[PDB]
Short mmCIF file of all heavy atoms in Angstrom, two decimals:
data_model
loop_
_atom_site.label_atom_id
_atom_site.label_comp_id
_atom_site.label_asym_id
_atom_site.label_seq_id
_atom_site.Cartn_x
_atom_site.Cartn_y
_atom_site.Cartn_z
N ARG A 6 104.07 87.87 151.30
CA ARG A 6 103.94 89.32 151.37
C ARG A 6 105.20 89.86 152.04
O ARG A 6 105.41 89.65 153.24
CB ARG A 6 102.68 89.70 152.15
CG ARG A 6 102.24 91.14 151.99
CD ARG A 6 101.02 91.42 152.86
NE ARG A 6 100.73 92.85 152.95
CZ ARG A 6 99.86 93.38 153.81
NH1 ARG A 6 99.21 92.60 154.65
NH2 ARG A 6 99.66 94.69 153.82
N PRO A 15 96.83 82.67 146.74
CA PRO A 15 95.78 83.14 145.82
C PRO A 15 95.12 81.97 145.11
O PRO A 15 95.79 81.18 144.44
CB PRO A 15 96.54 84.04 144.85
CG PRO A 15 97.94 83.53 144.87
CD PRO A 15 98.18 83.02 146.27
N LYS A 16 93.80 81.86 145.27
CA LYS A 16 93.02 80.79 144.65
C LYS A 16 91.78 81.39 144.01
O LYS A 16 91.29 82.44 144.42
CB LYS A 16 92.64 79.72 145.68
CG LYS A 16 92.27 80.29 147.04
CD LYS A 16 92.33 79.22 148.12
CE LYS A 16 92.09 79.82 149.50
NZ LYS A 16 93.12 80.84 149.85
N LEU A 17 91.27 80.70 142.99
CA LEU A 17 90.16 81.21 142.21
C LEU A 17 88.99 80.23 142.23
O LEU A 17 89.18 79.02 142.32
CB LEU A 17 90.57 81.46 140.75
CG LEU A 17 91.14 82.84 140.44
CD1 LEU A 17 91.53 82.93 138.97
CD2 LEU A 17 90.13 83.91 140.79
N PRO A 18 87.75 80.74 142.16
CA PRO A 18 86.59 79.85 142.02
C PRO A 18 86.69 79.00 140.76
O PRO A 18 86.50 79.50 139.65
CB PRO A 18 85.41 80.83 141.94
CG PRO A 18 85.88 82.06 142.62
CD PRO A 18 87.35 82.15 142.32
N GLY A 61 48.01 76.99 118.29
CA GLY A 61 49.26 77.05 119.03
C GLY A 61 49.63 75.77 119.73
O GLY A 61 50.80 75.59 120.09
N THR A 245 99.47 74.14 112.10
CA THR A 245 99.60 73.77 113.51
C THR A 245 100.88 74.34 114.11
O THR A 245 100.89 74.74 115.28
CB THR A 245 99.57 72.25 113.65
OG1 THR A 245 98.40 71.72 113.02
CG2 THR A 245 99.56 71.85 115.12
N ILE A 248 101.05 77.99 115.86
CA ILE A 248 100.41 78.28 117.14
C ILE A 248 101.50 78.70 118.12
O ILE A 248 102.40 77.91 118.43
CB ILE A 248 99.63 77.07 117.65
CG1 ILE A 248 98.44 76.78 116.73
CG2 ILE A 248 99.17 77.29 119.08
CD1 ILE A 248 97.70 75.50 117.06
N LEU A 249 101.42 79.94 118.60
CA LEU A 249 102.46 80.51 119.45
C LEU A 249 101.94 80.86 120.84
O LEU A 249 102.59 81.61 121.57
CB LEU A 249 103.06 81.75 118.79
CG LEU A 249 103.42 81.59 117.31
CD1 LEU A 249 103.61 82.95 116.65
CD2 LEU A 249 104.66 80.73 117.14
N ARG A 251 100.18 79.20 124.50
CA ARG A 251 100.00 77.95 125.24
C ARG A 251 98.53 77.55 125.29
O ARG A 251 98.20 76.36 125.20
CB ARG A 251 100.57 78.09 126.65
CG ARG A 251 100.40 76.85 127.52
CD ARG A 251 101.08 75.64 126.90
NE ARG A 251 102.52 75.85 126.71
CZ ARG A 251 103.43 75.63 127.66
NH1 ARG A 251 103.06 75.19 128.85
NH2 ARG A 251 104.71 75.84 127.40
N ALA A 254 97.49 76.10 122.11
CA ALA A 254 98.09 74.77 122.01
C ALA A 254 97.26 73.74 122.77
O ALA A 254 96.94 72.67 122.24
CB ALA A 254 99.53 74.79 122.52
N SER A 284 77.19 66.01 125.81
CA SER A 284 76.50 67.16 126.39
C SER A 284 77.35 68.42 126.36
O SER A 284 76.80 69.52 126.50
CB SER A 284 76.09 66.86 127.84
OG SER A 284 77.23 66.60 128.65
N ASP A 320 87.16 86.65 128.10
CA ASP A 320 88.15 86.12 129.04
C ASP A 320 89.19 85.26 128.32
O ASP A 320 89.29 84.05 128.51
CB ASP A 320 87.46 85.33 130.16
CG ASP A 320 86.46 86.16 130.93
OD1 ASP A 320 86.27 87.34 130.58
OD2 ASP A 320 85.86 85.63 131.89
N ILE A 321 89.98 85.94 127.48
CA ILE A 321 91.11 85.34 126.78
C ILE A 321 92.25 86.35 126.76
O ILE A 321 92.12 87.48 127.23
CB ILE A 321 90.75 84.90 125.34
CG1 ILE A 321 90.22 86.09 124.53
CG2 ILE A 321 89.75 83.75 125.35
CD1 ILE A 321 89.98 85.76 123.07
N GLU A 322 93.38 85.92 126.20
CA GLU A 322 94.58 86.76 126.09
C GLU A 322 94.50 87.55 124.79
O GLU A 322 95.05 87.15 123.77
CB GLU A 322 95.84 85.90 126.13
CG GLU A 322 96.15 85.26 127.46
CD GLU A 322 97.52 84.62 127.49
OE1 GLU A 322 98.52 85.36 127.59
OE2 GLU A 322 97.60 83.38 127.39
N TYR A 323 93.83 88.70 124.83
CA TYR A 323 93.62 89.46 123.61
C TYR A 323 94.93 89.96 123.02
O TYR A 323 95.18 89.80 121.81
CB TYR A 323 92.66 90.63 123.87
CG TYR A 323 91.24 90.19 124.14
CD1 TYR A 323 90.66 90.35 125.38
CD2 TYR A 323 90.48 89.60 123.14
CE1 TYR A 323 89.36 89.95 125.63
CE2 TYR A 323 89.18 89.19 123.37
CZ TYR A 323 88.63 89.37 124.62
OH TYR A 323 87.33 88.97 124.87
N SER A 325 98.32 89.09 123.44
CA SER A 325 99.22 88.07 122.91
C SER A 325 98.65 87.41 121.66
O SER A 325 99.37 87.20 120.68
CB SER A 325 99.51 87.02 123.99
OG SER A 325 99.62 87.61 125.27
N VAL A 375 110.20 78.81 112.32
CA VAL A 375 111.52 78.83 112.95
C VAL A 375 112.29 80.08 112.54
O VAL A 375 113.01 80.68 113.35
CB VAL A 375 112.27 77.54 112.61
CG1 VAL A 375 113.50 77.38 113.47
CG2 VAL A 375 111.36 76.33 112.78
N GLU A 382 112.38 88.10 116.66
CA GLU A 382 113.28 88.35 117.78
C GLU A 382 114.22 89.51 117.48
O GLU A 382 114.59 90.26 118.38
CB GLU A 382 114.06 87.08 118.11
CG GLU A 382 115.12 87.25 119.19
CD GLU A 382 114.56 87.09 120.59
OE1 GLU A 382 113.42 86.60 120.72
OE2 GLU A 382 115.26 87.46 121.56
N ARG A 386 110.77 91.77 119.52
CA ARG A 386 109.45 91.20 119.81
C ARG A 386 108.35 92.26 119.78
O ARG A 386 107.31 92.11 120.43
CB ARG A 386 109.46 90.47 121.16
CG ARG A 386 109.85 89.00 121.06
CD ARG A 386 110.55 88.52 122.32
NE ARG A 386 111.95 88.95 122.36
CZ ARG A 386 112.38 90.04 122.98
NH1 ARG A 386 111.53 90.83 123.63
NH2 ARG A 386 113.67 90.35 122.96
N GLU A 418 91.41 98.13 116.51
CA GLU A 418 92.73 97.87 117.07
C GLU A 418 93.85 98.31 116.13
O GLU A 418 94.88 98.80 116.59
CB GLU A 418 92.88 96.38 117.39
CG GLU A 418 94.25 95.98 117.93
CD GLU A 418 94.45 96.34 119.39
OE1 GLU A 418 93.54 96.95 120.00
OE2 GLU A 418 95.51 95.99 119.95
N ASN C 167 52.63 76.76 126.94
CA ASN C 167 52.61 77.62 125.76
C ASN C 167 51.79 78.88 125.98
O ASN C 167 52.07 79.92 125.36
CB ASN C 167 52.07 76.84 124.56
CG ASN C 167 52.03 77.67 123.29
OD1 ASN C 167 52.86 78.56 123.09
ND2 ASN C 167 51.07 77.38 122.42
N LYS C 206 72.28 68.33 135.31
CA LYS C 206 71.58 67.53 134.32
C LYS C 206 70.10 67.38 134.62
O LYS C 206 69.35 66.89 133.77
CB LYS C 206 72.22 66.13 134.24
CG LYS C 206 73.73 66.14 134.13
CD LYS C 206 74.18 66.75 132.82
CE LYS C 206 73.70 65.93 131.64
NZ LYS C 206 74.08 66.56 130.35
N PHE C 230 89.32 89.39 139.91
CA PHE C 230 90.60 88.70 140.04
C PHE C 230 90.72 87.60 138.99
O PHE C 230 91.76 87.48 138.33
CB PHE C 230 90.76 88.13 141.45
CG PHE C 230 92.06 87.42 141.67
CD1 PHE C 230 93.24 87.95 141.18
CD2 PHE C 230 92.11 86.23 142.37
CE1 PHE C 230 94.45 87.30 141.37
CE2 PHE C 230 93.31 85.58 142.57
CZ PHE C 230 94.48 86.11 142.07
N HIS C 232 88.98 87.57 136.21
CA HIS C 232 88.97 88.27 134.93
C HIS C 232 90.37 88.75 134.56
O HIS C 232 90.79 88.62 133.40
CB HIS C 232 88.00 89.44 134.97
CG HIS C 232 87.87 90.17 133.67
ND1 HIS C 232 87.40 89.57 132.52
CD2 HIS C 232 88.15 91.46 133.34
CE1 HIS C 232 87.40 90.45 131.54
NE2 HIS C 232 87.85 91.60 132.01
N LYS C 235 92.47 85.95 133.55
CA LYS C 235 92.10 85.43 132.25
C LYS C 235 92.55 86.32 131.10
O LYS C 235 92.96 85.82 130.05
CB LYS C 235 90.58 85.23 132.17
CG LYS C 235 90.09 83.95 132.81
CD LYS C 235 90.63 82.73 132.08
CE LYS C 235 90.05 81.45 132.65
NZ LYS C 235 88.56 81.43 132.56
N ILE C 236 92.48 87.64 131.28
CA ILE C 236 92.83 88.57 130.20
C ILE C 236 94.33 88.61 130.00
O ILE C 236 94.82 88.55 128.86
CB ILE C 236 92.25 89.96 130.50
CG1 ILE C 236 90.73 89.95 130.38
CG2 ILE C 236 92.83 90.99 129.54
CD1 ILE C 236 90.23 89.62 129.00
N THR C 237 95.09 88.70 131.09
CA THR C 237 96.55 88.69 131.00
C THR C 237 97.04 87.34 130.50
O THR C 237 97.77 87.26 129.50
CB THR C 237 97.16 89.00 132.37
OG1 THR C 237 96.75 88.00 133.31
CG2 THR C 237 96.73 90.37 132.86
N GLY C 238 96.65 86.26 131.17
CA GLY C 238 97.16 84.94 130.90
C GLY C 238 98.15 84.44 131.92
O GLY C 238 98.80 83.41 131.68
N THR C 241 97.45 82.94 138.99
CA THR C 241 96.94 83.77 140.08
C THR C 241 98.07 84.30 140.95
O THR C 241 97.99 85.43 141.45
CB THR C 241 95.94 82.98 140.93
OG1 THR C 241 96.64 82.00 141.71
CG2 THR C 241 94.94 82.27 140.03
N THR C 245 99.22 88.07 141.47
CA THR C 245 99.34 88.58 142.83
C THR C 245 100.66 89.32 143.03
O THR C 245 100.74 90.22 143.88
CB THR C 245 99.22 87.43 143.84
OG1 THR C 245 98.29 86.46 143.35
CG2 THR C 245 98.74 87.95 145.19
N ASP C 255 96.43 94.81 150.98
CA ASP C 255 95.62 94.52 152.16
C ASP C 255 94.28 93.91 151.78
O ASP C 255 93.81 92.97 152.43
CB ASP C 255 95.41 95.80 152.98
CG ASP C 255 96.71 96.40 153.47
OD1 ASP C 255 97.78 95.81 153.20
OD2 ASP C 255 96.68 97.46 154.13
N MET C 261 91.90 86.67 150.33
CA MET C 261 92.54 85.35 150.35
C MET C 261 92.75 84.83 151.77
O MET C 261 93.82 84.29 152.08
CB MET C 261 93.86 85.39 149.58
CG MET C 261 93.67 85.60 148.09
SD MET C 261 92.58 84.35 147.37
CE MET C 261 91.95 85.22 145.94
N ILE C 267 86.90 79.20 148.91
CA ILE C 267 86.66 79.94 147.67
C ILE C 267 87.14 79.20 146.44
O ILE C 267 86.91 79.67 145.32
CB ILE C 267 87.32 81.34 147.71
CG1 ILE C 267 88.84 81.21 147.78
CG2 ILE C 267 86.80 82.14 148.90
CD1 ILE C 267 89.54 82.54 147.91
N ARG C 308 92.27 95.39 126.41
CA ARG C 308 91.19 95.12 125.47
C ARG C 308 90.13 94.19 126.06
O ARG C 308 89.70 93.22 125.43
CB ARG C 308 91.73 94.55 124.15
CG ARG C 308 92.60 95.51 123.36
CD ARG C 308 94.07 95.13 123.45
NE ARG C 308 94.90 96.00 122.63
CZ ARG C 308 95.53 97.08 123.08
NH1 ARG C 308 95.43 97.42 124.36
NH2 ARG C 308 96.26 97.81 122.26
N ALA C 344 106.11 82.06 121.67
CA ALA C 344 107.00 80.91 121.68
C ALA C 344 106.38 79.80 120.84
O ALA C 344 105.17 79.55 120.94
CB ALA C 344 107.27 80.42 123.10
N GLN C 346 105.16 76.24 119.68
CA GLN C 346 104.50 75.21 120.48
C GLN C 346 104.58 73.82 119.84
O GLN C 346 104.74 72.83 120.56
CB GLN C 346 103.03 75.59 120.71
CG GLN C 346 102.85 76.92 121.42
CD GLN C 346 102.96 76.80 122.93
OE1 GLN C 346 102.66 75.75 123.51
NE2 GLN C 346 103.40 77.87 123.58
N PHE C 347 104.46 73.73 118.52
CA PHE C 347 104.54 72.47 117.81
C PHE C 347 105.64 72.53 116.76
O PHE C 347 105.93 73.60 116.20
CB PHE C 347 103.20 72.12 117.14
CG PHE C 347 102.02 72.19 118.07
CD1 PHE C 347 101.30 73.36 118.22
CD2 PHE C 347 101.63 71.07 118.79
CE1 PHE C 347 100.21 73.42 119.07
CE2 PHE C 347 100.54 71.13 119.65
CZ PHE C 347 99.83 72.31 119.79
N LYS C 353 113.17 73.39 116.18
CA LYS C 353 112.55 74.46 116.95
C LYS C 353 113.31 75.76 116.72
O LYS C 353 114.45 75.76 116.24
CB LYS C 353 112.54 74.12 118.45
CG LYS C 353 111.77 72.86 118.79
CD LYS C 353 111.83 72.57 120.29
CE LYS C 353 113.15 71.92 120.67
NZ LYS C 353 113.33 70.61 119.99
N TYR C 354 112.65 76.87 117.04
CA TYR C 354 113.32 78.16 117.00
C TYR C 354 114.46 78.17 118.01
O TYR C 354 114.22 78.12 119.22
CB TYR C 354 112.34 79.30 117.27
CG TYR C 354 113.03 80.58 117.67
CD1 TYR C 354 114.01 81.15 116.86
CD2 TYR C 354 112.71 81.23 118.85
CE1 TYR C 354 114.65 82.31 117.23
CE2 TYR C 354 113.35 82.40 119.22
CZ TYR C 354 114.31 82.94 118.40
OH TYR C 354 114.95 84.10 118.77
N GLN C 370 112.26 91.75 128.77
CA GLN C 370 111.83 90.76 127.78
C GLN C 370 110.58 90.00 128.21
O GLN C 370 109.84 89.51 127.35
CB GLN C 370 112.97 89.79 127.49
CG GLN C 370 112.75 88.89 126.28
CD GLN C 370 114.05 88.43 125.66
OE1 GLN C 370 115.04 89.15 125.66
NE2 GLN C 370 114.05 87.21 125.14
N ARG C 372 107.57 89.32 131.79
CA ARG C 372 106.57 89.97 132.62
C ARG C 372 106.93 89.89 134.10
O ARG C 372 106.05 89.81 134.96
CB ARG C 372 105.19 89.36 132.36
CG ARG C 372 104.77 89.41 130.91
CD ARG C 372 103.42 88.75 130.69
NE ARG C 372 103.01 88.81 129.29
CZ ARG C 372 101.86 88.33 128.83
NH1 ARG C 372 101.00 87.75 129.65
NH2 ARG C 372 101.57 88.42 127.54
#
Side-chain angles (χ1 to χ4, degrees):
Chain A
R6 195 183 169 191
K16 39 198 175 299
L17 271 179
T245 306
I248 293 173
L249 313 163
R251 179 59 60 85
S284 61
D320 302 1
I321 57 174
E322 290 190 76
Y323 290 113
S325 322
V375 192
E382 175 85 14
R386 271 149 282 95
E418 178 78 358
Chain C
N167 180 31
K206 312 294 297 177
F230 181 42
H232 183 62
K235 279 296 185 58
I236 290 297
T237 61
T241 72
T245 325
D255 299 359
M261 292 305 155
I267 65 184
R308 295 106 176 95
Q346 301 277 331
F347 308 91
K353 300 179 280 299
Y354 162 55
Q370 192 154 326
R372 304 178 180 181

